[PDB]
Structure 1
Amino acid sequence: NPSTTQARVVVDELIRGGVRDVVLCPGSRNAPLAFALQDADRSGRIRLHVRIDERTAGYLAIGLAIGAGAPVCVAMTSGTAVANLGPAVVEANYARVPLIVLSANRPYELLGTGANQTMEQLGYFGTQVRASISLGLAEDAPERTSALNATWRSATCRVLAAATGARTANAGPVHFDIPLREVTPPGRPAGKPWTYTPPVTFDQPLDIDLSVDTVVISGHGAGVHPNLAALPTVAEPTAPRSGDNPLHPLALPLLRPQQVIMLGRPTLHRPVSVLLADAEVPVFALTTGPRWPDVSGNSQATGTRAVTTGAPRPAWLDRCAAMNRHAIAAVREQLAAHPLTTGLHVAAAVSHALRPGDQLVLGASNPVRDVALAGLDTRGIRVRSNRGVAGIDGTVSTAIGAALAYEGAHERTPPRTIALIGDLTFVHDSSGLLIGPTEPIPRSLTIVVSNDNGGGIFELLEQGDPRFSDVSSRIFGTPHDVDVGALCRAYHVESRQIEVDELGPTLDQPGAGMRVLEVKADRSSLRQLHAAIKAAL
């Protein structure tokens, strides 16, 4: 049967292409490549992960992909799959995550006359994916077997290349269809991919004078630049550090830089935004990919590399270091001077509890920002966050998937994965905790939940102004009164409600493979704390 042959060949080439994990959900139809994936999983060639929640399944795949940087497949099996995978596919697009979406259309059946149970199309595939490839029906012609083998493996390599950005340097989601109707031909020798793609470089050098008072701002997907290591650098948590000279975010308004070098895609901090939009400050964007970030339209130039002349003035260098120490002081003072535990307190505790080789998974809203404010030094540490579109959905499964993949990478040679998320974020993707006994479960994952019973970040915005006090709580705060401990145990997951002093010591000593550490926090004092911090500036 050609379909069975086709499936094994595709699965084989996917494995050759670096795919180690595949996510499935039970549906009305059986999965594309269903049986070939089973045989591959049973023989340990790949690892399968099954979920009931289709939405959290997609975010599990994102986690599995960003964990060690490998391409990951997720298989559509139902008439709700497309809708549910939407959020994950969007994040995969904007965060540039190698996500292969597997589908199986039925060419011998009618389309467009009613609802169908394996495919219900929306409009996002045409705007989010790097490629849409359909394998075409497998036909019975044994004398064309080697031609078909070459066709299937070539197309599969196209899917992988598009997903990983092998030739485009633009990773993202790919839609891969293997149409269904109702001894496996060998690939290349020694497990090589059918179509090999050697390393690729995109080179766009920009001339930059470093004697001009320069600050470096790095965001999601930023590259490593040794020739900029000396410059003062405001680096987002997910940005890899190039050097030794960090500049705290809060010290930025205290300085008047004369030019800016922007690495990757910055999404955090208003003073960062204000600075990039400053029309008198030349901005140079150094990023990988087809497009560049520039909300204001102020960027003077874009590229991938800097050709530097000169060096930063010692006066400028010293002024930056002074404001840096000043900002760091102000943050630590006002935290100590504050009795009530907030999300910012928790962030610092988690931050100082971290050790080299750890993986840190940060949720959206305050957690990702608070860690940057707590002055985390990210070197020797691998930080993940869904900054593509910054949703508070699917962060639990992301952390789980990231853990499994990061643990898998070292079993192949286990390191800790610590997640810091808000309470809303936890409630959103609570169903990601539901993992059957037959499914893979991380051995070294801890989820820290800063629970201030609502959306703390809204206290820091104009809707957090005291004149909105009576109306703000319901529509922005949104308190929920959820018993977290009861929720975790409902899913049979180890959980402790502890204070911030114990957070360090607790994280230092291991436990069950999956555990949730909950820390009670307050948000009523957040706007004042931040005001006090800038007052110390």
Structure 2
Amino acid sequence: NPSTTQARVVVDELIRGGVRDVVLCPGSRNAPLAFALQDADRSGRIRLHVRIDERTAGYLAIGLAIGAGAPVCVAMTSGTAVANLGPAVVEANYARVPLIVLSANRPYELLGTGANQTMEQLGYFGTQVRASISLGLAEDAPERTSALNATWRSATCRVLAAATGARTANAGPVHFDIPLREPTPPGRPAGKPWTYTPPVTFDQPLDIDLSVDTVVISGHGAGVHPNLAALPTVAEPTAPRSGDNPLHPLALPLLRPQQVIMLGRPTLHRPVSVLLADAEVPVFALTTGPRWPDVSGNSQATGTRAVTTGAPRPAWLDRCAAMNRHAIAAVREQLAAHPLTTGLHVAAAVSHALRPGDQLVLGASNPVRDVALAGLDTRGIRVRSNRGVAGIDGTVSTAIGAALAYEGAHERTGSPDSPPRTIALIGDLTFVHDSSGLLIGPTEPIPRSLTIVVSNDNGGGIFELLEQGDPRFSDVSSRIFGTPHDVDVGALCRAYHVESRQIEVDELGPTLDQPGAGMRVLEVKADRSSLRQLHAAIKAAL
């Protein structure tokens, strides 16, 4: 049949385009390209992942795409599919993740008259996706076989190109529809894609005088700038570090920089937000994509790289280095002097235990910030986190997807060594949010060396550090911002047959040092009633 010939053409081109992982979910109707995907899965050409939860499936694809950079597909099958994939698609848009959403519309059926179970469309597709491409019904015309193969494969590489940013340098989600009526022509030789897109280089030089007292702030999506490696740099955990001169985030208010070089999209730390908005401080935004950020409209110029003149003052370097030391010492000393265990303690333990080659997945909220407060040195490490829109949803499956993709890349190198560790640090709310992600059937791929560390302070500790955390709200803030839940984390892990251990913070390093089951949850109970005082103590020790 032509529909079944079409499916095998697309899947073949998708494999040629670098798609190593595809996610599906049971639904009202068959998945798009399901049979072509099943054939390729048994052949090992591609790895399928099945989940019941459509929401966690979308974030599973996010992890499968950020773990090694490959485009990943998700196959919608139901009417709830658009709604449940929404959060992952929005994140894919903002985090610039190549996420291809597969659909299978039926043009012989009625649209707009009732329950459109193929697609219940929301409004987010019009604003989030890089492209909406539909293949058109497969003609029963064997004379056109040569031509239909060319256009199907050209359109499939179009979907891939839009998803990976091959020509735009702005990866993101793409909607790909392959229509169907109810109820293999070859590609290019040597496994090359039908339409090849060579490496694209968007270039936007900016003149910057480095003799002016400059601090670098690198956030999500930041590039590597070897000509900025010497500068003091306040780097977010997901920012690749260009050099060896880190500036602690808490030292920034103890300095007066005269200009700021902003790499990527920063989302963390109020000292960062205040400095970038300072009208007396020129801010140069260097990005890898067409977008650039601003705080209060204070971005003076945008580019992709810097053409640097001069060099930083040694007196400015030495005083930045000294404040960096003061902030590092205030954290470690006040943490040691603190009686109770907080998430900041847990983050410091997780950070001392990381080894080069590791993959670190950071949940939103306090964990991704605490890891920066503990001064983690990310060099030699791959650090992921859904900074696109900073949700606490889907983090478990993002970690599972990242682990599966990172390990698959390692196995592909053919190295004899153990698959590298994926270690995740997530809050307790974040864990409860995506507990469904732990349920993985026996037929489905499971990570070989993933450890999810759950710092559990029975609620959202980050709100103790905001205006609602001031003691004048202790009357009221417990219920509406603390949100305690009393969840038995161990019992939840037992229900999903996930190896689980509850340990105290001193035991975390040793436990992570010794491998265990392929997937496991380490729970370290923490306190958040002392969190605001602890941060106040660090500020007072600065």
Q: Same fold (TM over 0.5)?
A: yes
Q: 1:400-436: per-residue Cα shift (whole Å, max 9, x none)?
A: 0000000000111100000000000000000000000
Question: Secondary structure of the residue that 2:156 maps to in structure 1?
Answer: helix
- The corresponding residue for 1:488 is 493
Q: CA deviation at 1:378?
A: 0.1
Q: CA deviation at 1:118?
A: 1.6
Which residue, out of 490, 508, 515, partners 2:520? Answer: 515
Q: CA deviation at 1:115?
A: 1.2
Q: CA deviation at 1:174?
A: 0.2
Q: CA deviation at 1:462?
A: 0.3
Q: CA deviation at 1:265?
A: 0.3
Q: CA deviation at 1:291?
A: 1.5
- Distance in 1, Cα, partners of 2:309 & 2:160: 40
Q: 1:233-260: per-residue Cα shift (whole Å, max 9, x none)?
A: 0000000010010000000000000000
Question: Secondary structure of the residue that 2:253 maps to in structure 1?
Answer: coil
Question: Secondary structure of the residue that 2:260 maps to in structure 1?
Answer: strand
Unaligned 5+ runs, structure 1? none
- The corresponding residue for 2:416 is none
Question: Secondary structure of the residue that 2:377 maps to in structure 1?
Answer: coil
- Distance in 2, Cα, partners of 1:364 & 1:63: 15
Moved runs in structure 1, 4+ residues, more than 2 A? none
- The corresponding residue for 1:373 is 373
- Distance in 2, Cα, partners of 1:2 & 1:256: 67
- Distance in 2, Cα, partners of 1:396 & 1:381: 20
- Distance in 2, Cα, partners of 1:422 & 1:277: 30
- Distance in 2, Cα, partners of 1:192 & 1:493: 41
Question: Secondary structure of the residue that 1:155 maps to in structure 2?
Answer: helix
- Distance in 1, Cα, partners of 2:356 & 2:406: 14
Q: 1:154-204: per-residue Cα shift (whole Å, max 9, x none)?
A: 000000000000000000000000001019000000000000001110000
- The corresponding residue for 1:525 is 530
- Distance in 2, Cα, partners of 1:299 & 1:437: 51
Q: 1:278-302: per-residue Cα shift (whole Å, max 9, x none)?
A: 0000000000212110031011100
Report the TM-score when normalising by structure 1: 1.00
Q: 1:377-401: per-residue Cα shift (whole Å, max 9, x none)?
A: 0000000000000000000000000
Q: CA deviation at 1:499?
A: 0.1
Question: Secondary structure of the residue that 1:515 maps to in structure 2?
Answer: strand
- The corresponding residue for 2:122 is 122
- Distance in 1, Cα, partners of 2:501 & 2:183: 53
- Distance in 2, Cα, partners of 1:70 & 1:219: 21
- Distance in 2, Cα, partners of 1:449 & 1:183: 48
Q: CA deviation at 1:116?
A: 1.6
- Distance in 2, Cα, partners of 1:498 & 1:97: 35
- Distance in 1, Cα, partners of 2:494 & 2:397: 17
- The corresponding residue for 1:442 is 447
- Distance in 1, Cα, partners of 2:183 & 2:346: 57
Q: CA deviation at 1:213?
A: 0.3
Is 1:498 the counterpart of 2:524 in the alignment?
A: no
- Distance in 2, Cα, partners of 1:482 & 1:490: 13
Question: Secondary structure of the residue that 1:215 maps to in structure 2?
Answer: strand
- Distance in 2, Cα, partners of 1:324 & 1:298: 25
- Distance in 2, Cα, partners of 1:69 & 1:436: 25
- Distance in 1, Cα, partners of 2:527 & 2:54: 33
- The corresponding residue for 1:266 is 266
- Percent identity reads 100
- Distance in 2, Cα, partners of 1:52 & 1:435: 9
Report the TM-score when normalising by structure 2: 0.99
- The corresponding residue for 1:52 is 52
Q: CA deviation at 1:339?
A: 1.0
Is 1:230 the counterpart of 2:236 in the alignment?
A: no
- Distance in 2, Cα, partners of 1:366 & 1:25: 32
- Distance in 1, Cα, partners of 2:280 & 2:527: 40
Show the 5 A alignment for 1:463-482: 463-482=468-487
- Distance in 2, Cα, partners of 1:416 & 1:388: 24
Question: Secondary structure of the residue that 1:449 maps to in structure 2?
Answer: strand
- Distance in 1, Cα, partners of 2:153 & 2:265: 35
Question: Secondary structure of the residue that 1:73 maps to in structure 2?
Answer: strand
- Distance in 2, Cα, partners of 1:198 & 1:79: 38
